[PDB]
Design a binder for this molecule. Structure first.
Ligand code: BCL
Ligand code: BCL
Ligand code: BCL
Ligand code: BCL
Ligand code: BCL
Ligand code: BCL
Ligand code: BCL
Ligand code: BCL
Ligand code: BCL
Lengths: 358, 358, 358
């Protein structure tokens, strides 16, 4: 018998605060859909206020994994700020390593997020809008020291390809969205444009030649792509009054999958209007993308959610309904909640709303 | 335990008549995949002979819904006629309303449906062909009175966009196929071309300015798109000797879905050749599209179908086989029928054929 | 209760040999997702060494089916050889028949398979790479005697279309990937280019006019398309020291599906390095494509695998683990193996690795 066991905990700050602590654990005795096993990964994300006056934060990410004995790592650290409601700017650096190979990089880039329409007729009549169609434009300048022969080979190969292959800006997407990543684009109503290569040259860096590229692309979303529809919400820099962090990891092999998440960050709750608040709307891409793997083994659900509201707050509406309550702490399990967990784990996006207030 | 309960009833006219009464009810205690709940809708479609000499019918549609408290409505009424086997013409009017906002519209449009091949070698050798690849071309002239400020804003915004944005005819499809509608295109082997904007201007209508647009698009189908493969069959104007109608609705929320259908129309049965008739072949798009939502909760099937043949007719072949019979009335439930209901509810298109005769 | 019963047997040659005998049987009491039933098919593939000095083999394929009473057949026989590691050449002939219609054909064609990158940094650090992004270019010259009126009609229709329709090279793909074949492309991360028509003319053949076309297309793969990622491996001509063959067939209708496979060919095992061997990595397209039909009825798994190693060899690693062993013969059933069978039958590609050695 295949059984998914999971526990989730949300502990909320009150007042005007959107912050929450989020913890999760899950295990299921079914294999992942990776054609290489075992596959283990640990991820740590950190972000701190940097310059509140200019709205800059400093964010870092560390990814480490082991896949069929191969050890991988990627880190990236960047300073990011909104310039306007639509244009965001970044500058950063990082590295990637795989077994005995590694390389570094630095970059700067701007992203401009544009909705296809704006209408007060929609805004005033839909209290909790979900879909927002739009397109996001990246402009990136990246640099990689060419300080081993593999880097040199790839740089020269790519220079040669760009020079000789008229369809490079098109076919590069076949390379980029490796394996089933390609398939996931259409699944989420996401489109990636042909790229533009605006600049390609070698620089004389302090330790040697540096490969420098300037390039652009856009990606379109029909409304489910959270990176576009919830662009401002997903970067709550104006709510980051202290450092935030999240650590997560999984272990997986032919026998099953185990996962753990432990984080604290702003944006967990939202002003719902009318003096109510809600847990933020569930982003759609995680459910749709995970939906591509959640349907391969039947499973029973053994799931519990615990939500701790701030002192003095009460739930006004929850659907699925909670099972029990002890002051500010509410618990869901079994019944309609278990059924909703099955639904979203298989790719469904049916709404689970929690509205609360003092 | 998740259980889908459903009942279907088909009552057929005899002789040369293709007409039937179709009733259905279903309920299932699982949530819909809507990221806004509750979601309730009622739909009424009507069509009557208008000018049998020119083949015009007058069709009307009313859609009403409530989604997370927002009240929606759209109506459309049109006169439609075949000009040729491939070209159909229409003229009509309607309105849309959402909360405190509303607008009207009128239009005329032609649609030309073209198959990619015609071959007697296929026709004479395949007795019940299903797939037909082809492409359908729309040419539309629509008008909307710009009689509130939101209409004015959207009209001017769109005029501005068409003027400034070279990729408008491309990216408009991201806006148009909102949310998971985008994803459904590829699922059904359906392609939407870039649009052509042939005309855009303001008219001085009786009550004020009117926004007028003339535009075109084609959509391609690899064979499953019923709008293309069964183009003539889906508009049985030559069989409409009296008014036809269908009413349907659903209620849904975090706890489940309930639905009801009650209609009467031509085209329910078909001449199968050899003096046999069949219930029409199941259209594929409904099953494929619904397949995108039917896989998120395991369910047991409690389904019954009742088919009442005209007096004196008998079933010659049915697969899945029926369970019971009382004169002209045949009933299916359990066993292989329940298994077929599960199959098609999850997106399968395995054939369930009923052939009958006197 | 829906139950899938299946048995698989692999019997391996030893030494440096990659050959194996592969047998399979499966049955399941659920309907196929074919909108025409019954659907029965038998396939026979044969290949023999032809000219070991030039690397030519002679391969033949016979497909026969019956679909809703219509009898179909297609045969193809060809000589195929690698010219280089990337370029393969072929010349051959065949026929197609459907009911009272038939036609023949002959052809020659080259295919060039190109990976998007080559990197020693990947090669030396990933011991068993799976994804390889790339693009494959076909150049085909085919001839069909126009020796009945239907052939003449289609030839003239196509000549007319190519002449009049600017989007022919684009829309031809709607015709080509009939029905759900269209949808399967994106599912497997596969792209088909617009075609190029380089030549179209009529020849005066011995018995009459012959329609001759010269045309090209490429197809891209993001890494799962085995035709691209495992290009050399899939044509083990250098391992074909004697004839190989496989016969397979299925019978299906509204009640269920039964299938049988019986074959012997090189390429069943692979040198894994370190003096180990493995069963070849599971190709991804079969699992992904079948995944599009494997999710419509819940089923229980009654599956057994038997692997017979060459004398004196032992399994070093298997995950899922085997259940029993008798000398060189190992058996899997139930437990984690049954769970893996469910997973891959529904479209999962989680790795099942068997490594063995003396
Ligand atoms: C990922 C989905 C979208 C996308 C959506 C966005 C969004 C949204 C943003 C960017 C931004 C950036 N993108 Mg982009 N971007 C995509 C694909 C790309 C690709 C590529 C080759 O595929 C590249 C090179 C880039 C490059 C870049 C940079 C120019 C820029 C800064 C990145 C950074 O510092 O990351 C650092 C990396 C990480 C922090 C790793 C973790 C990333 C995941 C997604 C974050 C999960 C947050 C978690 C749920 C809660 C975190 C709480 C913690 C306490 C922080 N994008 C795809 C198409 N991109 C930012 C920008 O505008 O800069 C100007 C920005 O806000
Ligand atoms: C930029 C990201 C990718 C990449 C993306 C592409 C794309 C996209 C294309 C090529 C194409 C080519 N690339 Mg490459 N290429 C990369 C790195 C490499 C490396 C290397 C040492 O890693 C090599 C040897 C090559 C070499 C080549 C050839 C195999 C091929 C045709 C080039 C030509 O001029 O003819 N590239 C990097 C890793 N390359 C072109 C081609 O025709 O591929 C079929 C092509 O369109
Ligand atoms: C470059 C990337 C972008 C960015 C892209 C996104 C995207 C895209 C999304 C978010 C979302 C969220 N982000 Mg943000 N985000 C950025 C910076 C920040 C900052 C900040 C001050 O810098 C903060 C505090 C946040 C905070 C938040 C939350 C409001 C929200 C997640 C809520 C939740 O409950 O998660 C619960 C958390 C978990 C269940 C697990 C989180 C742990 C794992 C490790 C996080 C990463 C998972 C992902 C698969 C990894 C992909 C990595 C790439 C391949 C490189 N982001 C940068 C600028 N963020 C999500 C959301 O809901 O938006 C509305 C969302 O979809
Ligand atoms: C919907 C799937 C296909 C499509 C397939 C068809 C087909 C097929 C036809 C049209 C026709 C029309 N289409 Mg078109 N069309 C599509 C997308 C569009 C879009 C758009 C922005 O997406 C627009 C503006 C149009 C516009 C139009 C008009 C020019 C024209 C008349 C519409 C009408 O009166 O509807 C009135 C609206 C309704 C009746 C609502 C109900 C619609 C559903 C689909 C009908 C279900 C029938 C039910 C199962 C049985 C009904 C029995 C009742 C007793 C009647 N189409 C997509 C791509 N279109 C018609 C034509 O050729 O006119 C010249 C026609 O026959
Ligand atoms: C016609 C159907 C859609 C629509 C489809 C599109 C498409 C498609 C595009 C735009 C684009 C734009 N549209 Mg719009 N647009 C609509 C209605 C609006 C409304 C409104 C008051 O409702 C507004 C303010 C706008 C305004 C704008 C800008 C946000 C944007 C760039 C225009 C420019 O000149 O620079 N449109 C209607 C509702 N719009 C363009 C853009 O660059 O978006 C990123 C673009 O390509
Ligand atoms: C503008 C739209 C087009 C059109 C488009 C289609 C399409 C597309 C299809 C049909 C199909 C059918 N149509 Mg027609 N149809 C038109 C006009 C008509 C007229 C007429 C004389 O005007 C008649 C009598 C019919 C009759 C019929 C039947 C032969 C057949 C449904 C059989 C059945 O058992 O349904 C059983 C009915 C039900 C199970 C439920 C019906 C109730 C619901 C409310 C109907 C609409 C559902 C749909 C999801 C709503 C989408 C609305 C849009 C978003 C606006 N149509 C107009 C001209 N029609 C279907 C078929 O099988 O074709 C071969 C089909 O796929
Ligand atoms: C099928 C998936 C890919 C593809 C991948 C490949 C690969 C890979 C190769 C070709 C090759 C060829 N392709 Mg191609 N090809 C595709 C689509 C096409 C289409 C089309 C209209 O769709 C056409 C006309 C062609 C035409 C051709 C010829 C030019 C050439 C020889 C074919 C042959 O003899 O087949 C004979 C037909 C059969 C043997 C039928 C069986 C085919 C199945 C796929 C084989 C299963 C093997 C089985 C698992 C184990 C067999 C063991 C037996 C003992 C042999 N391809 C799609 C896009 N094509 C070959 C080449 O390069 O020639 C120069 C080659 O190696
Ligand atoms: C080559 C493979 C396909 C094929 C692929 C296509 C494609 C692709 C297109 C056509 C198009 C057309 N083809 Mg065709 N066509 C085939 C065989 C035929 C047969 C036949 C006797 O079998 C006929 C009568 C036709 C006739 C036609 C028209 C229906 C149509 C417009 C042609 C024109 O000049 O205007 N083709 C073969 C079987 N045909 C064109 C069109 O506009 O379709 C809408 C088009 O783009
Ligand atoms: C024109 C077609 C190409 C070609 C295309 C492919 C493709 C594509 C693939 C293979 C794969 C394999 N091929 Mg090869 N292959 C060709 C010629 C050969 C020759 C030869 C010396 O000529 C040999 C010995 C082989 C041998 C092999 C094996 C190494 C491997 C299957 C292993 C296994 O366990 O299958 C177990 C076998 C079965 C489970 C059942 C096989 C029985 C059925 C009848 C085979 C065909 C099924 C398929 C759905 C039919 C599609 C037909 C088309 C619509 C026309 N191929 C020709 C040149 N071959 C597969 C692989 O794993 O590659 C890494 C794979 O994906």
């Amino acid at each position: 018998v295949t059984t998914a066991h999971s526990d989730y905990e949300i502990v909320l700050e009150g007042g005007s605060s959107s912050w929450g602590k989020v913890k999760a654990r899950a295990k299921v005795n079914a294999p992942p859909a990776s054609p290489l096993l075992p596959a283990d990964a640990d991820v740590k994300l950190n972000v701190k206020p940097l310059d509140p006056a200019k709205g800059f934060v400093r964010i870092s990410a560390v990814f480490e994994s082991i896949v069929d004995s191969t050890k991988n790592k990627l880190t990236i650290e960047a300073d990011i700020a909104n310039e306007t409601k639509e244009r965001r700017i970044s500058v950063g650096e990082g590295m990637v390593s795989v077994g005995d190979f590694s390389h570094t990089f630095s970059f700067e880039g701007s992203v401009v997020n544009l909705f296809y329409y704006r209408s007060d007729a929609v805004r005033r009549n839909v209290p909790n809008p979900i879909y927002m169609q739009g397109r996001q434009f990246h402009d990136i300048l990246m640099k990689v020291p060419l300080d081993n022969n593999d880097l040199i080979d790839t740089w020269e190969g790519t220079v040669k390809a760009i020079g000789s292959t008229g369809a490079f800006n098109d076919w590069i997407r076949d390379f980029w969205f490796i394996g089933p990543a390609f398939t996931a684009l259409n699944e989420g109503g996401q489109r990636i444009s042909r790229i533009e290569v605006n600049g390609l040259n070698t620089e004389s860096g302090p330790k040697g030649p540096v490969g420098v590229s300037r390039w652009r692309f856009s990606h379109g979303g029909s409304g489910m792509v959270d990176s576009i529809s919830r662009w401002a919400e997903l970067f709550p820099s104006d709510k980051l009054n202290r450092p935030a962090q999240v650590e997560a990891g999984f272990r997986s092999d032919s026998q099953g999958i185990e996962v753990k998440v432990d984080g604290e960050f702003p944006g967990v709750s939202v002003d719902a209007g009318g003096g109510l608040r809600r847990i933020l709307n569930h982003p759609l891409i995680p459910l749709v993308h995970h939906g591509m793997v959640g349907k391969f083994n039947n499973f029973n659900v053994d799931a519990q959610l615990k939500v701790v509201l701030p002192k003095g707050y009460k739930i006004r509406y929850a659907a699925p309904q909670y099972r029990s309550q002890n002051l500010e702490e509410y618990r869901w399990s079994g019944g309609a909640y278990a059924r909703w967990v099955e639904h979203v784990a298989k790719g469904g996006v049916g709404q689970f709303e929690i509205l609360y207030a003092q």
